[PDB]
Amino acid sequence: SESQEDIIRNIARHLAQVGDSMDRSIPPGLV
């Protein structure tokens, strides 16, 4: 059940993605 390697990998890609998009549209009126 799950593998830290895969876990960390998926989380990592997700982290970069979440951040990459969080800049394209800041919910808090970008301020």
């Binding site: 876990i7 960390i8 951040g19 990459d20 800049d23 800041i26 301020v31």
Partner: protein, 160 residues
Amino acid sequence: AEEEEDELYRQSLEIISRYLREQATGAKDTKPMGRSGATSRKALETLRRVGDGVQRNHETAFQGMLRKLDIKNEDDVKSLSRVMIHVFSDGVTNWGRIVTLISFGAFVAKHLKTINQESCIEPLAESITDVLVRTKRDWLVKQRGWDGFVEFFHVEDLEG
């Protein structure tokens, strides 16, 4: 007496460290009696707004990552480091990534403290600042670093 000193590093480790520490402790350690760190105040402010926001809006991402991650010792630190590098391995860098990462970092740290694990906060702060300034220093210095972020986000709250 030789060109090498970098306030960015010191200011980064100082801010990040004092951040996770003061944020993961819940207390208030504002006893400088000499310091100030203007950029630090503004920068932090930005981190408070954008940070709290992502925490409230993207709370699902933080919780999920933590749920899968699950950490209780410095050992995993190397694994976390791997995660960071694994995300930067692409070559994409921006305020979005940095803040998102830093945010998740602090959160996990908060949990670490809640689970009586402050000793694992050291690797957290050092790791974040390490990867950020070790592989992405050029990006920071290229976009002004902290200031450029305060300008890109803007936090003007003055009337006159």
